[PDB]
């Protein structure tokens, strides 16, 4: 079966190089024009570069022209992308896609049809030492019905953190939002659950934060303070 495996991701400081590699397995690699397409975090796609069936590049994106350098190898069934002089705006996923029409199968040669897509890598760029999360409480407003309370994680890097409530049992009424990014690169997010105000002044509620790279599992007992 057709497979498209890419590799090369990892944290890289700004002003360095990387070499992404996409390997194809399951078709005649010489009759298909490859493409490399980025995907910004939580945004739309964006074409980056491509290569035709005769190892002849087809130009790069307008805002990236000057640094990226594509190359192809039919003998080893591989497609390489060298990347130099990075900036903080080049963090995104990267897929390597394949064309549809085999060459000389019907005017000109074909370039469209990005049909088969591999699961992209997670290239990122930043300059910040790995710091642990800070956990903050969000007590109930103490103003009818059901009131919401939560906990906010601030100044952590990198992803992903995992937040649960009541050690894992409480699942109906939870909400956790994606990790927004901050000024200094230290991320932040929060989670909140809504419970009856009648159960606000005597029950037990704890949110549990787990950070894998920093190797921590912190507990937070959230209750109204007055």
């Amino acid at each position: 079966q057709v497979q498209l495996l890419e590799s090369g991701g990892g944290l890289v400081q700004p002003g360095r190089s990387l070499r992404l590699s996409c390997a194809a397995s399951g078709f005649t690699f010489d009759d298909y024009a490859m493409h490399w397409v980025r995907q910004a975090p939580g945004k739309g796609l964006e074409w980056v570069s491509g290569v035709s069936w005769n190892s002849g590049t087809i130009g790069y994106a307008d805002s990236v022209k000057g640094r990226f350098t594509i190359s192809r190898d039919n003998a080893k069934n591989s497609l390489y992308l060298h990347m130099r002089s990075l900036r903080a705006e080049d963090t995104a996923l990267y897929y390597c896609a394949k064309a549809v029409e085999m060459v000389r199968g019907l005017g000109a040669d074909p370039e469209y049809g990005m049909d088969v897509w591999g699961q992209g890598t997670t290239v990122t760029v930043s300059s910040a030492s790995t710091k642990g999360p800070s956990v903050f409480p969000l007590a109930p407003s103490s103003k009818g019905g059901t009131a919401a309370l939560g906990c906010l994680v601030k100044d952590y890097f990198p992803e992903p953190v995992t937040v649960s409530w009541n050690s894992g049992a409480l699942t109906s009424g939870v909400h956790t939002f994606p990790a927004v990014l901050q000024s200094s690169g230290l991320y932040s997010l929060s989670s909140v659950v809504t419970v009856p105000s009648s159960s606000l002044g005597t029950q037990t509620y704890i949110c549990n934060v787990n950070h894998k790279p920093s190797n921590t599992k912190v507990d937070k007992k959230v209750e109204p303070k007055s």
Binding site: G44, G150, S190
Partner: protein, 218 residues
């Protein structure tokens, strides 16, 4: 250097009715062969995107016959004969005429329901933000439809900007509602100066924008 646009920007569809979307260009893509080079692409929530239509209207391989493509010149349209529960996500149109290629901003297709109003809450900084110089305020909006809604952060009528950010979640599978949350961060030099802090929400379901305010020093 060709810029596209799509319309409508975001539309709610309900399972069992046709859906139409229009992609517009700047230069007509009619090549010498007589073929338009536009392509229509789909992305599901949480997976790699997939191909829908290539060469204007030639249906791609392996997709069902419920999609239709039409148009020419500088205007093209995609219409699904019948929409179902497995047709949500993002749609893009891609040129293939003049390199570099380009992708449209993207149309967001989701499931429609009855309009619901948000529930609003406010959250001031704790005592852990009184010994750490960093003060954060959080405004929370849950269980509202549709996606569009907006917030003002108000401090003694002096609207701010830049420093306040926001984030939203995916559509809840069961009741099909959204949640937004905004945060405002500041130093320990002005937080303990201004008195009344307010989060203002504007949404269709509310007659007037709702202001939730708190005062310092209870």
């Amino acid at each position: 250097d060709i810029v596209m646009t799509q319309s409508p920007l975001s539309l709610p569809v309900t399972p069992g009715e046709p859906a139409s979307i229009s992609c517009r260009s700047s230069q007509s893509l009619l090549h010498s062969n007589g073929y338009n080079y536009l392509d229509w692409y789909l992305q599901k929530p949480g997976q790699s995107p997939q191909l829908l239509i290539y060469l204007g209207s030639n249906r791609a391989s392996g997709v069902p016959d419920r999609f239709s493509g039409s148009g020419s010149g500088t205007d093209f349209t995609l219409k699904i004969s019948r929409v179902e529960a497995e047709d949500v996500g993002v749609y893009y149109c891609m040129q293939a005429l003049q390199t570099p290629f380009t992708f449209g901003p993207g149309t967001k297709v989701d499931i429609k329901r009855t309009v619901a109003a948000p529930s609003v809450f406010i959250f001031p900084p704790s005592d852990e933000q009184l010994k750490s110089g960093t003060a954060s305020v959080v405004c929370l909006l849950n269980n509202f439809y549709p996606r569009e809604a907006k917030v003002q952060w108000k401090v003694d009528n002096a609207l701010q900007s830049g420093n306040s950010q926001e984030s939203v979640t995916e559509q809840d599978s069961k009741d099909s509602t959204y949640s937004l949350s905004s945060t405002l961060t500041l130093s320990k030099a002005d937080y303990e100066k201004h008195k009344v802090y307010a989060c203002e929400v504007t949404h269709q379901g509310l007659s007037s924008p709702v202001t939730k305010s708190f005062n310092r020093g209870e």
